Amino acid sequence: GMVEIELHRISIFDPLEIIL
Amino acid sequence: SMIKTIAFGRYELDTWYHSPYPEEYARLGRLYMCEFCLKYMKSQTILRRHMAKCVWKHPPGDEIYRKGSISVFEVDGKKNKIYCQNLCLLAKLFLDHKTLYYDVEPFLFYVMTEADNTGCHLIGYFSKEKNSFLNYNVSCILTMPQYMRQGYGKMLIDFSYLLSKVEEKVGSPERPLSDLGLISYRSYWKEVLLRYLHNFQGKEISIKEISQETAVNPVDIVSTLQALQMLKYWKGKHLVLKRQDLIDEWIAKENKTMDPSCLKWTP
Ligand SMILES: Cc1cc(-c2ccccc2)cc(C(=O)NNS(=O)(=O)c2cccc(O)c2)c1F
Ligand SMILES: [Zn+2]
């Protein structure tokens, strides 16, 4: 359950902190 | 074998792509269609005779959505083979990449209509495999030319993801999309996570939770997050950049919205 997007890979389950 | 125009309801439409109508019909270059049962005929005289006796006033199948003048009918290709074949041949006049027309039995067809002072008119549809093992929640998707770029396509796309949500699946349209269809999905994906992000005031988010709520595929969410320049990378962590520029520009937009409480359907 990972996404490859450019040039690294993300995990669907990792929390991504929202910012401004 | 090239058809140039069709007569559909009160509209005359230029056709765009080849569709394998029987050569006896195709070689005339022009088709006359009943807008209700989707039968195709050779002449307007024959069409006039047909409409005078045609019993159909709406698609077959079950009306599984109604709000105001908008309906969605679920048509089983195994139970309404002829209608669905006529639907697929019509669709092929406006979709370049559609390849299946006659073996409609593996498919469900979701047909959206609008009722008005004349009748209950076809707006568009999407087909869907009854068993997709590649998680396609849409096979082919189209609005009729007279309803393109007027919000109806966004309703159709939204309805496809509404079905996925009730199914508790995440899905994606099968590729390749038409030019306009890809344009429409990207715009819809952008609007969807702007609504999610505007309606959300936690401070961390996983792709999973967005995907689980919206039923949008994780791949589509990330490419939309990159398309909106909101997917940034600092140190070793990926971040999401909330552009209120966009939530406010989106907030200025508003009917042509699907109402989930008006869905009478279970998987
Ligand atoms: C999937 C799809 C296909 C076709 C199509 C494809 C091939 C042949 C004919 C039609 C048309 C539309 C449409 O109508 N898009 N415009 S939209 O509804 O106003 C719209 C849609 C999304 C976001 C918006 O902000 C506005 C569509 F969504
Ligand atoms: Zn008819």
Residue B24 contacts residue B9 (beta carbons within 8 Å)? no
Task: State whether residue B227 sits within 8 Å of chain A by CB.
Answer: no
**Strand pairing partners for B30?**
B5
The one-character DSSP state at B141 is E
- Maximum C-alpha span of chain B: 73
Half-sphere exposure of B130 (CA within 13 A, CB side): 10
Q: Which segments of chain B belong to CATH 1.10.10.10?
A: 182-251
* Residues from A in contact with B at Cβ < 8 Å: 1, 3, 5, 8, 10-20
Experimental method: X-ray
Comparing CA positions, the residue from B187, B116, B115 lying closest to residue B158 is: B187
Catalytic residues of B: 174
- Cβ pair B218:A19 closer than 8 A: no
What distance in Å separates residue A19's CA from the closest CA in chain B? 5
Q: Which DSSP string do the residues of B60-103 spell out, in sequence order? A: SSEEEEEETTEEEEEEETTTSHHHHHHHHHHHHTT-SS---SS-
Instruction: Of B168, B74, B169, give the one whose Cα is nearest residue B113.
Output: B74
- The residue of chain B nearest to residue A3, with distances taken between CA atoms, is B219
Return the CATH number of B182-251, one of 3.90.930.12, 3.40.190.10, 1.10.10.10, 3.30.70.120: 1.10.10.10
Domain with CATH 3.30.60.60 in chain B: 1-56
In a mutagenesis test of the B interface, which of A4, A6, A19, A20 is the best target, namely the one with the most B β-carbons within 10 Å? Answer: A19
Q: Shortest CA distance to B64 belongs to which of B101, B108, B106? A: B108
Closest CA to B93 of B137, B147, B142, B126: B142
Q: In this complex, is the C-beta atom of B207 within 8 Å of any C-beta atom belonging to chain A?
A: yes
Question: Which chain A residues contact residue B239 at CB under 8 A?
Answer: 16-19
Cis peptide bond upstream of B145, omega within 30: no
Q: Indicate the resolution in Å.
A: 2.1
Q: In what side-by-side order are the strands of the sheet with A16-19?
A: B204-205, A16-19, B237-241, B231-234
CATH match of B1-56 with 3.30.60.60? yes
| Structure-token pair, residue B153 | 């396509």
Residue of chain A whose alpha carbon sits nearest to that of B220? A3
Query: Smallest Cβ distance to B240: which of A5, A11, A16?
Result: A16
How many C-beta atoms lie closer than 10 Å to residue B124's C-beta? Answer: 21
| Closest ligand 1 atom number to CA of residue B187 | 23
Residue A3 DSSP one-character state: E
Q: How many residues does chain B have?
A: 267
